[PDB]
Subunit: 296 residues, 4 copies
């Protein structure tokens, strides 16, 4: 269902700090027409932390409605509050999302029993497929392979993992412990290539917001086993993958989009800021030039 | 205003998962009568992450009402959403809190510019004193000393720090950069003794929920400069400090209070769980009995 | 020159704690005849830390003489003492080694200028090609890509890197900064597969000591672009890669060899010990059974 | 036997890269006359890693000879090679050292069983008191409290710890597990103050090489229980402690001694370098002048 290049969509805002619905719809349309194979609205790159409950639901509804069955929609239903995660997940199901992205809880640092209770509670409350989002660079705690495999064995609707660790030996461990039917998606753009050769089938991507066509061509080459061409694409994309997280990626991505001439405002929500250092903007501009996408 | 032993209060719940208002009031009154010098409602140990906005506000209101001016109240007023932080902060001010505890944002990892924007926006929105809560073991990012000093220099109501790093060299750096008038409180029970000799004047404490009298005695000895006596208390308390975070301290504290005969249910909100391993309960019971806390 | 599967050779010892020269020769012969493409004597897996200067030179001499030009020999010349590294490197050159493996200095933690001085001093003292061995899990410090690229640009005989980080995004960075002529070898068995698709051409391997034929077949499949078959080999080898570093790999490898019936004693040198936990030996035995190599 | 301020002595070298025996003797005599209470020759700050066996021995012999029983001498006698450690330890005993400093092995990462074998073999080979030097920021592995206690319980001449973690909670854990008779010395200048209030009785110090009198005064105030006075010294010394490890402290200490007019050359052995950035020298000079150390 989910494969190849899947943007973790930004959430654009107006000058007045409302959801810029027309910008969001346009970005989704453009993503689909440039070759993105799926959509993740209201994830981390979507600024889930600074959306109200209502706005989070609106972002998911609007992504589901816009996509209109053309590509599958994996709605962000992440929080560190299990009851709220259930409510987000049930809203996503009822509005027509195809799957759920559920982050390992951050900040309050549950132990293994707490992870089983969190993901089990969600799995019991919805019938949609659930993807575990493992990102210890943000959550501190990391779901281990034994816990992942136990969840996969216990609950039919826990089907996959967004693996943002960038440690691809884990892709092999997860493939052996959970089975080759388990859907593994990279959550780290710069190691997505190696992640797929170890068993992954796609990438939930920051850079795809900015360069959807080349990211789609990159993932197509991997799926066809043209790993020579995929490396050629890797070498062209890697400087952009890296430039987009010199400073926080949500600000960096929106800057890159405006420099491409897209209808996306620079506005982000505190504690994120839109101001980038001169050297950061130049690193992004040169990485975009290097993929032609700008100057050539 | 804030000094010696200050519990980061638990938020007790009923078997029906409502706020146990009677248990909360009794806990505060017991804490005061045993020597706690101040109160922090709706912090991390207070399960702020699993409280709704209205419950969080109600916990703060109740704590202010119950303290009745006997001890100062530092309300938890911080999330990783600046607008929500301002809303919790302004509620706390209008209901009569004496100060605010504002955590460095977790999960979404702002950069230094974002920290200045976050803490600056909160400081401009209230007139109450603000304490920066630095806990990188939960937030991943760490506010550095230059940023902390800039905030103190820029905003007159940014007045202190909850320093939960456990790296007491930072106490010396913050004392020099921010001034000896900057109020430093330990956020790490096990290193609170050294923290104070480096410049701190108290501890926002997990263990004080369980053992408020001995924790108050420990801090009193420190403020009297009886460091020999403070080290004897340290040796009695350290095993309990340590046993309470074998598993998440929220669950462990409520287990301990229940065992001591306090009217506190075991209930916690997912992803916390109340089930503890037997080896964990055994370690807690041994540390409680070494101190001599069972009335029976 | 160096490609595919290259064992970091163990150094066998007799009951009496001398170098077991006949065992070493036999292990080398067996490695070559099973398909290993190169040899690294007196590296980390070779217990370089507990060899005398004389014994280190003897191990390199004996590996060079045994190999007799059939496969290339990359001699360990690593220490955290630059003068001693020069002496080891010059001995290796004079005895007929084909290249040098030079670890980033451990324990004394030089800064970037110190790394330039260390690797530059060695590059000036020999004409052999030098491979940088980056392993911060043992050295704490990590050579960054700018430093690596500067060394490669400055000195003709710094030609490659043993990259033991297991973070394969670095393979892409090193490929772009140092050029595709730069020889990158994985130093992490479990991520070797993804490391090669990102630009690597081989692996300096622990597991190859134990399963040289399958490791050689694994690397052959990668070099032929049969990444489907390589993944099949990965899934068979990964449990053995992981089982060999539950406890220190030098002890684990020698245990595995004796369980295969090879003439290798269990003896290691303090502070390493030969005693393995029951659960460790069983994890290794099952991983060997899973590659048939034992039971079938 | 060991208490208050104990420099980890630098090893000065000549322009020809020989041991500057005259400079070393003058440094020791100056350290004693300024209040240092003991001496550690041929430790980390003494560039043990770049000394030959015969130079290391000569540094220890000279330090013992020069101290002339006025202050005790704790010889560096530890590498990551147990047999070499025994040889350095036995030399130190036979030349008249009072105790031994034995680092947890670096680079080759023994497990707990290996630590027991390492420290046990050394303890059985000498009758001198042994101090465990725990410095995971250099060794990666960290001796845990259970292992330390087992060693103290098993070997009567394992008597104390050099604890360079900077995590003073470990001081409380070691005091409880090993006994209040276990001698704890800080290995981290910046946290030495809190370390002592948690149970320590002195500091094996980098900064004491540069500022031995004020460091001795600082430690004297602590042992007198004048913690208010100790905090005033902390505030004066902390900027110097910090400035001396902007770049490797070996280079920074010799730079500072040279600037103060001591007969100590700048020479260091690769991979250390004597060249410091101007911003580093400026920070050191400012911290030296804040204390008032320039005679001119």
């Amino acid at each position: 269902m989910f494969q190849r290049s899947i943007p973790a969509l930004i959430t654009p805002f107006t000058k007045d700090n409302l959801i810029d619905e027309d910008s969001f719809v346009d970005h989704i349309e453009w993503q689909i027409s440039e070759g993105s194979s799926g959509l993740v609205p209201a994830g981390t790159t979507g600024e889930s932390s600074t959306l109200s409950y209502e706005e989070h639901c609106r972002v998911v509804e609007l992504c589901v409605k816009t996509a209109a069955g053309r590509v599958p929609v994996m709605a962000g239903a992440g929080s560190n509050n299990t009851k709220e995660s259930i409510e987000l997940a049930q809203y996503a199901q009822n509005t027509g999302a195809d799957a759920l992205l559920v982050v390992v809880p951050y900040y309050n640092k549950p132990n293994k029993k707490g992870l089983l209770a969190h993901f089990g509670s969600i799995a019991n409350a919805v019938s949609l497929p659930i993807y575990i989002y493992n990102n210890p660079s943000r959550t501190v705690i990391e779901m281990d392979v034994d816990t992942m495999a136990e969840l996969v064995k216990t609950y039919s609707n826990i089907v996959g993992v967004k693996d943002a660790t960038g440690r691809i030996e884990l892709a092999s461990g997860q493939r052996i412990a959970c089975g080759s039917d388990f859907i593994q998606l990279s959550g780290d753009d710069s190691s997505a290539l190696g992640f797929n050769v170890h068993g992954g089938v796609g990438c939930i991507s920051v850079t795809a917001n900015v360069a959807p066509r080349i990211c789609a061509e990159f993932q197509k080459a991997i799926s066809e086993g043209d790993y020579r061409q995929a490396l050629e694409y890797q070498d062209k994309l890697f400087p952009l993958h890296q430039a987009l997280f010199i400073e926080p990626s949500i600000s960096s991505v929106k800057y890159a989009l405006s420099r491409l001439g897209r209808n996306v405002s620079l506005v982000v929500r505190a504690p994120m800021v839109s101001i980038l250092e001169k050297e950061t903007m130049f690193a992004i501009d040169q990485a975009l030039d290097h993929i032609g996408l700008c100057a050539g």
